[PDB]
Amino acid sequence: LHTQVGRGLLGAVVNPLGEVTDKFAVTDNSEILYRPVDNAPPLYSERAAIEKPFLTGIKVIDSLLTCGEGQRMGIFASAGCGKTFLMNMLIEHSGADIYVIGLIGERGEEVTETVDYLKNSEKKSRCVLVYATSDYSSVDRCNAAYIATAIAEFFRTEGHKVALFIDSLTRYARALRDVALAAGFDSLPRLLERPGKLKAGGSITAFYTVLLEDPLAEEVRSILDGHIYLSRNLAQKGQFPAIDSLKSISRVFTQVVDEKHRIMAAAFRELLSEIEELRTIIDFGEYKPGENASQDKIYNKISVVESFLKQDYRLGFTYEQTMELIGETIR
Secondary structure, eight states, X not given: OEEEESGGGTTEEEOTTSOEEEESOOOSXXXXXXXXXXXXXXXXXXXXXXXXXXXXXXXXXXXHSOEETTOEEEEEEOTTSSHHHHHHHHHHHSOXXXXXXXXXXXXXXXHHHHHHHHHTOTTGGGEEEEEOOTTSOHHHHHHHHHHHHHHHHHHHHTTOEEEEEEEOHHHHHHHHHHHHHHHOOTHHHHHTTSOEEBSSSOEEEEEEEEEOOOHHHHHHHHXXXXXXXXXXXXXXXXXXXXBOGGGOEXXXXXXXXXXXXXXXXXXXXXXXXXXXXXXXXXXXXXXXXXXXXXXXXXXXXXXXXXXXXXXXXXXXXXXHHHHHHHHHHTO
């Protein structure tokens, strides 16, 4: 019903009962406070409009799927789609004050893998990790999401720019339906309307992961402010991150980017639309060089478009670098 919060949790690993189990970093701050994990969502008059961009340092996201402060974004992918490597990039190359990661998923090895990454991360002093393995009860794995959110809500009340990660929403939904069987559902919507930007405080930008083998994918997609879709076909071809921008959306995109950005994003998106039609024409074996000047122009733009989309997971790009690169690729 109550969990521990405060800056003293920075660098700590929290289990489904709210106790510090391990540490990936130590800070000089010792503050520990207690707040309930089932907090009422902010009123509509309590929330501020989503207007400032949450820069991620990932070229395809910042340019075509720009996130906003307080936005809730979905990450849709199958297993082995590099969903974990994408969240490592989001934590590494964004600029949030505090990162709150909630793992309600897998086995001890995947949790330890996240801690091992955090032990060598540049943001370890700003990170909190709440975990729930397969060995815990369904009630405990549900509570790991509420503990992670309540921890993020305290930092937001202090005025921090908080990034919340929940991996995964479906293994929360699995634990959710198991809990419902004991009683004989609706904690999903109230859980993911808790993030946002407060007029009187900071903001929580939340990234929720759902796994594709789906009905649950259809429910969450209309609740969130957008979704990022990791095609493992794109991963099979060697493009990382495997984000397919043509099937992804940020519903606050035009609210948080300016007119010049919007125009370049539209020109790039149609360039990619013409690119994938050429891939179909090529796969059909009906592309002959020199026979169509428009197709030849599109063909010679494949390499520069492919290199703008691809990004080494250890490199981050500023907004001006991203806009500079997408400027060159559309000319």
